Amino acid sequence: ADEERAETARLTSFIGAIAIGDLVKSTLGPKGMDKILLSSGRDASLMVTNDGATILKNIGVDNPAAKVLVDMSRVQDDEVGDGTTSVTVLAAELLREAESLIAKKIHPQTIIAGWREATKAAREALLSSAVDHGSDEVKFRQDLMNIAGTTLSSKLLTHHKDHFTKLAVEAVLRLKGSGNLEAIHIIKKLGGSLADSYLDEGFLLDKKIGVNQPKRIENAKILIANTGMDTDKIKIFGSRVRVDSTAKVAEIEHAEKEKMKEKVERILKHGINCFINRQLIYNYPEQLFGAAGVMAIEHADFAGVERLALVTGGEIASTFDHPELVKLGSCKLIEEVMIGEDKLIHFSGVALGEACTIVLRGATQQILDEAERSLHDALCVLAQTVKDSRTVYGGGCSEMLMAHAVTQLANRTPGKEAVAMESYAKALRMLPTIIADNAGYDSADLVAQLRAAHSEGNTTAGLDMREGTIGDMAILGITESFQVKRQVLLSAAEAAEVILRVDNIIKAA
Amino acid sequence: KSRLMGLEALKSHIMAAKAVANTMRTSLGPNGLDKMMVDKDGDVTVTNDGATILSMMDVDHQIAKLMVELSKSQDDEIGDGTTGVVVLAGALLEEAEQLLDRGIHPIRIADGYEQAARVAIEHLDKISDSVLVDIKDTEPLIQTAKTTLGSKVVNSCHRQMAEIAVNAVLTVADMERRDVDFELIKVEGKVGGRLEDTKLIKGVIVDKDFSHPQMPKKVEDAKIAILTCPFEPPKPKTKHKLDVTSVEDYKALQKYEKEKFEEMIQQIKETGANLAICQWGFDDEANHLLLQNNLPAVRWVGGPEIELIAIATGGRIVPRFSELTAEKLGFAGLVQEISFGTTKDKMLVIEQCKNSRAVTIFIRGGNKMIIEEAKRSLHDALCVIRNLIRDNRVVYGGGAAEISCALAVSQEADKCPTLEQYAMRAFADALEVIPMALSENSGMNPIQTMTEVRARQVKEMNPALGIDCLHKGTNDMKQQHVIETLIGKKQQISLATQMVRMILKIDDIRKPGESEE
Amino acid sequence: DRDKPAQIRFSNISAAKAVADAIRTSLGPKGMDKMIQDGKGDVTITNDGATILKQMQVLHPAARMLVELSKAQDIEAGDGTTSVVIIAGSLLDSCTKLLQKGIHPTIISESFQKALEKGIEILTDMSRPVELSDRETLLNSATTSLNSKVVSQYSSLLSPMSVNAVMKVIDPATATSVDLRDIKIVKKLGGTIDDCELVEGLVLTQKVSNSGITRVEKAKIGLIQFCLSAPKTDMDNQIVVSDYAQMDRVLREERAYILNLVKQIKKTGCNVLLIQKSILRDALSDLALHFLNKMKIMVIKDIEREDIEFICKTIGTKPVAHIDQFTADMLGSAELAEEVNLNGSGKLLKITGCASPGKTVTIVVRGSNKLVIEEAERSIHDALCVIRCLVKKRALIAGGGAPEIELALRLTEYSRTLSGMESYCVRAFADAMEVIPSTLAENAGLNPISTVTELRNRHAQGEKTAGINVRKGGISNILEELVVQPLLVSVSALTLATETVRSILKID
Amino acid sequence: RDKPAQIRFSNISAAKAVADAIRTSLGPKGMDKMIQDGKGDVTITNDGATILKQMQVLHPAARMLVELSKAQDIEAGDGTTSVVIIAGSLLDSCTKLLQKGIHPTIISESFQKALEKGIEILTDMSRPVELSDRETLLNSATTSLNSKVVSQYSSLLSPMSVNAVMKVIDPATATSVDLRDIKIVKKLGGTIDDCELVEGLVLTQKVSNSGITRVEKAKIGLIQFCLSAPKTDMDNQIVVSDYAQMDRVLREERAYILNLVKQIKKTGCNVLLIQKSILRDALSDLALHFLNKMKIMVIKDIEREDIEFICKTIGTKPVAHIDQFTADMLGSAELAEEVNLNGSGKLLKITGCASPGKTVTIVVRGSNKLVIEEAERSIHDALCVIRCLVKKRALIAGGGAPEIELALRLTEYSRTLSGMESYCVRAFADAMEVIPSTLAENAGLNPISTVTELRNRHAQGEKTAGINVRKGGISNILEELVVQPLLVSVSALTLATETVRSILKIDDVVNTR
């Protein structure tokens, strides 16, 4: 096999991680500038992104350390709901930081152990940088709005974000029980502009059964159901169907009709005003449902079927293990409505008011699918910002706080740790550099200013990267939810060390 | 045809044990920087006990080719110090060549190394104590079962995992009259739980087989009734069905199912338990009709799986539907359906108190690699207690036993003299390597660290103290509670000079032009 | 560490500037047309960049971006085509310097992107409103804007066709954007430029009906998006091959279906059936199709589904993939549906009038030959586009880059007053402008330098006391002979370029 | 930088390469060399002891070994190789420690540790000798003279070696009694048995003829003037454009000096040491005849050391010009003697001279030069080996053997020290044993037999005993009739010890501007 030992593998641990840093840091922040995505399998085909996650794929990653961070990115991207491009260069900075120092002969043992509590040293400061915002609801409104445009900013929606910055928080504003991805119903449908993106307050079926079933039913008793009206699922009534003869087609047709008529009548025994079937509904039953004055929605969307059941407070048929036993949803209105260009069956009066159906209106799907995707990312933060309504001063400000904290802790701890911890505290101060370098402004100025600012202990004043000056962190919007940083501050302050442990690297390829 | 002579060979010989043992020297102790393995397909994984990474390494060299074999029995009986011997077997050679660099026979010093082992052995035999006992040994094992799982998978391990690890051993370790071997104890990995969560089982635990939950999902008794044959009409794990010619034959068809169940049940009922392990699978339909009948079966059981529950219970598998006895069924002090985690179906928990030929500790896990990393860690420590429970012998060292035996064996070479005066000196120099060369990987200085426990040998010998392999503030083997089985280090003494002699054995290097495969 | 991106950005902007430079000769009508042997080793002869840039192109991503940037101006305005290509490198001439000069790439972007709006805003000062409500004025101005350009040939006839087709689908006095969405451009081989004409319902591919009546008035417009056929083996007739009675009997299977499937077509009933091409079908049973039209439903088969898509919207015939989808709503309601084989050569079903949303227009483009048809199209496409731009832009602006020679002065002037790091940029921003009309002053032949320099003062005087007059190719009022264009092609070329130049600065 | 690191290695490269082949030591081993020199000069070379000093090396690191060679010899007179060859043993440990990663200062300081621990053991083993009694003086002379050129003439040279130091001997033991007081005067004529240890100041002064200052009340003077005459000191009014003008001034020159040499004869001083300082040329070539005419020994511009021997030993100072006669600061000699053995040879003996209990003078005599040589060098170390005893007494062994005894016993100190240096001293401790192996190394084929056993044997003979390279066989090495004074090796230890840490004290090499 091929063993990459420490130094070489460490330089190899560097090659990807450091160079992967180059782009994701270049894209770091809104004034973070894009990297061309060259598709080497598909033509040369060019793509332009402010996001590193998309970069991690198009040109694949050989470097294991960088290959590791692709997890960390996605991990942080998916879990934190943000910090995609951030946590990555964060591992690039310290490895870069550790380069000369492990090239200074300093053990990663020395290094890792140093950055270990250094990582924790930022925490208490971070835990101190925790700024409760959203504690009040008017806070929570602006608190959500604080981080509403924050996540979508580096998730590469620069246009309709504002329109969603207003939308996404509203759905999250009502929750207040917990940040909810289920009660909140996510719909994105073509028609209208992307600033025409809509919020249905209630459940929504983007399904439309049309007038084939009753379109308008008020105070509608819902049957949330998996119950097959053609396929005819279990608790089956009959003999196992068989064909023994040429003309046998008749009886199987007649045998299923009863089996269909049973679940019709059985679900007609719910008295439900609207039948919602996660499976389809055949001609014989649907003409029975339609003659029963019941709206029968066929093959309704699976999570929505539960979301319907949830938000309308009803129960799902449980695969017709409950013939009558499934509880019934009741919403004051079932109305097929045209929002944008398309008719969707809108359920308002659903039992959950915190529940909101955001109906995203595509001008095209290619932005619309990217819309909700990046839009769903703030929700993670927002949902966890519902749970922890808290903030941390962004723009590298909490950095400079945690910098001094560990920068003094370097001089407070000192030793083989402060060997590493200073290198650590530099990557703390390296974050304010990138966004300012992305913004093309003097970092050593804006850093050592913000240093002097946090040397005066001003974390309410920070690098404000819109204009890219040093300025207030008042929660101008430049402030971040406490969730993100503690999350983003973590995995790279881990993985970089974790990468420092692997030294002998045996590559059997 | 080529022949690479002597030093040429020796040069070739040394080209591995320098670096490939340094792979261990870089990995010595937890503070030893751990070994990533990227596969033939490019699959990255972190490794230690580098016989792992050496098997994961693909051998281009006979020493590399050999070392995996030399490393095996160490990782077999002891389970730990796999990093030590490879270093130590890789080290002394470096001293040994230096003596042929001095112009000394490999012949002579190896001999003087062979008994240098012996004189270190007795010297090693002094260290710690050669007896630990059930209440005593556990906590130092619970320390080891920790510090193995606390170094190598979790940081604190878990007093779940530590104790449950020693108890898995201690279970059969007591069964084997103060011995054990592994097969008697088997860690069963399944993820979706937590690393923390380890179900210590005296026998098989596998997922049960039901169809409808409305029909009973139940274990019967604590006893299992093991069947190769049907408890439910046997389907040779391939396509088999039921069919009817009429609506009435459909009615005739299902009572067949229920009566065959009853037929099978009534047999398997009266002969003990009711509870089936049935190799073959059955239709998911009449499976609930068997539940509806009563007393569930287990269908689609692995061919060997029925045998695993067979003999470990002390019984067998029922080979034929007509051939039936509790012996051909299972013997279990516990059989019960138990949900594995909250994430999936009930594992049927067979805890076999009527016999255990394998006491199988189940382990849950958060991730495969880390539940592996646990299982990785475990079998390492499983074998050290296995050394202990067999003959309870421990040694304070890795910061001590070397510099301990490094002291006297080199001291012995003073009273040795001639060909063995360099041997037992340079022998113990390889001992000088590891605890030093551990501190190498550490941020502490190995040369510096050596000098201390060196000065300690002037102070104190075979000490309960030593270097800190845990990279602590205290440098001990006791406040460290670091140790091995006095077996292990002695067992580790065996291997190093064993390859040293081994590269000597014949005079024949002559190759087709191929000395490597 | 950001070295390579600059190098890449160099490599980007270089090959960016590069491909945009070659057109700056072929820029304009006096721009010289290149006969180009290609990878095919065969000559290709064009003037406008887009065709040139597509017809021979290798792959450089920035170059690939510009052929889009080229296409952009096209797909945006259908107009000012050659222009957007010239401004990019002109801007990059400023940018690369400023980048060399050290102006941060994010800055230059937002520098010129801010400075963009200031340019087109002073353009709105330059802008001259013409009546978008008056068809005549549009007929007068757009054709004159077309007479500022090459083709009046069929245009001065087809602008009466173009301005009307637009005017007919023009709802507002503003006349708004009006994409050609409601203008159906179809040709007919025979006929004339005069037999080219606007028609008020959707002309359908030929008329493909076998027994289907040659004309059915008040047409339910059926659509067949599903097969007419019983299952296949070796034909619409399903043939199991051994002995010929089975394949004779499976007909009873096959024959009845294609009859009933048709009987089902006439159940709900259709006066016209839209049927797309049979290769836009898996296949269509003639057995059905015979008995189909033999139940007397007039049909068009062999029609493009995108025609159908055009037809599904403009006359509102909702897509029918199925017989449940046979319904008076999904079966479009035509006022009249006929076929005309005549008034020239070729056959087409003429829907003349219909139930239609958004008005509707089809123009059936005819001529003594295909070329007379072809340039007629090329006569309208400009007219089609220049109107929909001129109506998209309330005012009009004279052409020849003289507004830029105005504006290059204007912004550089304010770029002083702007100050900021971008003063150097926003001047150089505007400074990029005059190079383009210079290149025209070179492309028409003149001193590109002497003149446009002087025009900046000419455009410092009356702002037009002079301009770049293409037939004169020199210092002249471009209002004395109108060299004039809708505001968009100016805005279009600009708004595109900066963005295309913007991200590249932000591109690593 | 890399240059600092490589140059110490490059020092260890050139230096250590030299100090090793510097052991064939003793033995009839290795084929004789006709050395074409660095300039192309063919030179037949043998007997590494002189081949040490003989060696022409370049580079700083190689020449410090010649500097090292020069150091031991002048110190003891014995063990010329002993100080250098161990620089091979030193730079053994050095690199391995630099290969161990040990710091140069630690490797430097490691030199002092083993040194202290070494001078410990060498004295521990060494058996004390009396440097007053004639006995070990004879014996240390014996074995040294047994290792010197003449074993046969070691006999009479021994009392002439023993009495020489015992002339200059100082109370009990001390480091004193140098060889500068000893004036070795080669006397052509006679034999080695005729070599004569004289108690007093003897000069190598060789003047005209004989009977010249053989008389009694012949003082030996120093004159920092010379005699006068017209055309010597006093003026000439006549100038020479003419050979006749040349004659009358030389005649007047001769006639006046003839009166002055009387005044030297009546001085009681029959040897003036005439200043090499030249007044006109000072003492005339016309004058030398006249001073010798009075039986006064002066040769033109007398050899300067004789001037200082008469200053140092006798206490003579210049006097007033012979025109004034003499202030008679000319030291007290009632006999100065020109001795012709076999009627030949020029030797000025000052008998009755003032001597300060020292300046014993061996007159090394012979009819040949080789005869004088074989005597002169042999008695020299016999003078030295006794001077060695006086300086530092007892005896260790010789030929490197007792160092292996130090080597065994030092590894025990290397066992005790428990430092990095305990290993560093240890890395050096057994590096000492290379000497007898490399002493026996250079003679031949089928090599490996005795070498490791040249070490192993001693450790088998343990801590007291080992192999004696001169007589062969294992015993207590310090007396096989194989000895050098305890001074010689402890003198050998520190020097190479010193010089090597300088290489470590080197940060990087340089070249002057």
Side-chain angles (χ1 to χ4, degrees), chain B residues 181 198 272 286 391 420:
Chain B
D181 286 342
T198 60
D391 292 343
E420 51 184 340

mmCIF file of all heavy atoms in Angstrom, chain B residues 181 198 272 286 391 420:
data_model
loop_
_atom_site.group_PDB
_atom_site.id
_atom_site.type_symbol
_atom_site.label_atom_id
_atom_site.label_comp_id
_atom_site.label_asym_id
_atom_site.label_seq_id
_atom_site.Cartn_x
_atom_site.Cartn_y
_atom_site.Cartn_z
ATOM 1 N N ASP B 181 -11.187 -17.781 26.049
ATOM 2 C CA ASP B 181 -10.836 -17.398 24.693
ATOM 3 C C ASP B 181 -11.992 -16.602 24.109
ATOM 4 O O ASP B 181 -13.089 -16.565 24.673
ATOM 5 C CB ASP B 181 -10.512 -18.623 23.834
ATOM 6 C CG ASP B 181 -9.159 -19.219 24.166
ATOM 7 O OD1 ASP B 181 -8.339 -18.516 24.794
ATOM 8 O OD2 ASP B 181 -8.914 -20.388 23.805
ATOM 9 N N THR B 198 -24.534 -1.038 25.629
ATOM 10 C CA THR B 198 -24.000 -2.365 25.371
ATOM 11 C C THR B 198 -24.838 -3.383 26.125
ATOM 12 O O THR B 198 -24.896 -3.371 27.356
ATOM 13 C CB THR B 198 -22.538 -2.495 25.804
ATOM 14 O OG1 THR B 198 -22.436 -2.245 27.211
ATOM 15 C CG2 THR B 198 -21.667 -1.508 25.060
ATOM 16 N N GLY B 272 -41.173 -28.210 24.521
ATOM 17 C CA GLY B 272 -40.470 -27.131 25.196
ATOM 18 C C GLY B 272 -40.438 -25.806 24.458
ATOM 19 O O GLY B 272 -40.449 -25.744 23.226
ATOM 20 N N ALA B 286 -49.507 -15.597 6.424
ATOM 21 C CA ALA B 286 -49.880 -16.545 7.463
ATOM 22 C C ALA B 286 -48.914 -16.498 8.642
ATOM 23 O O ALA B 286 -49.163 -17.136 9.671
ATOM 24 C CB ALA B 286 -49.988 -17.944 6.871
ATOM 25 N N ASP B 391 -4.278 -15.946 33.598
ATOM 26 C CA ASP B 391 -3.293 -15.887 34.671
ATOM 27 C C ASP B 391 -3.181 -14.424 35.047
ATOM 28 O O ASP B 391 -2.833 -13.607 34.194
ATOM 29 C CB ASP B 391 -1.931 -16.427 34.221
ATOM 30 C CG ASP B 391 -1.947 -17.919 33.952
ATOM 31 O OD1 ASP B 391 -2.882 -18.606 34.411
ATOM 32 O OD2 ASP B 391 -1.027 -18.410 33.265
ATOM 33 N N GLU B 420 27.762 -11.067 24.125
ATOM 34 C CA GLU B 420 26.546 -10.655 24.808
ATOM 35 C C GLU B 420 26.696 -9.353 25.585
ATOM 36 O O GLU B 420 25.700 -8.851 26.118
ATOM 37 C CB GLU B 420 26.118 -11.778 25.744
ATOM 38 C CG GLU B 420 27.249 -12.246 26.640
ATOM 39 C CD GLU B 420 26.841 -13.413 27.503
ATOM 40 O OE1 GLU B 420 25.621 -13.596 27.681
ATOM 41 O OE2 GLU B 420 27.727 -14.153 27.983
#
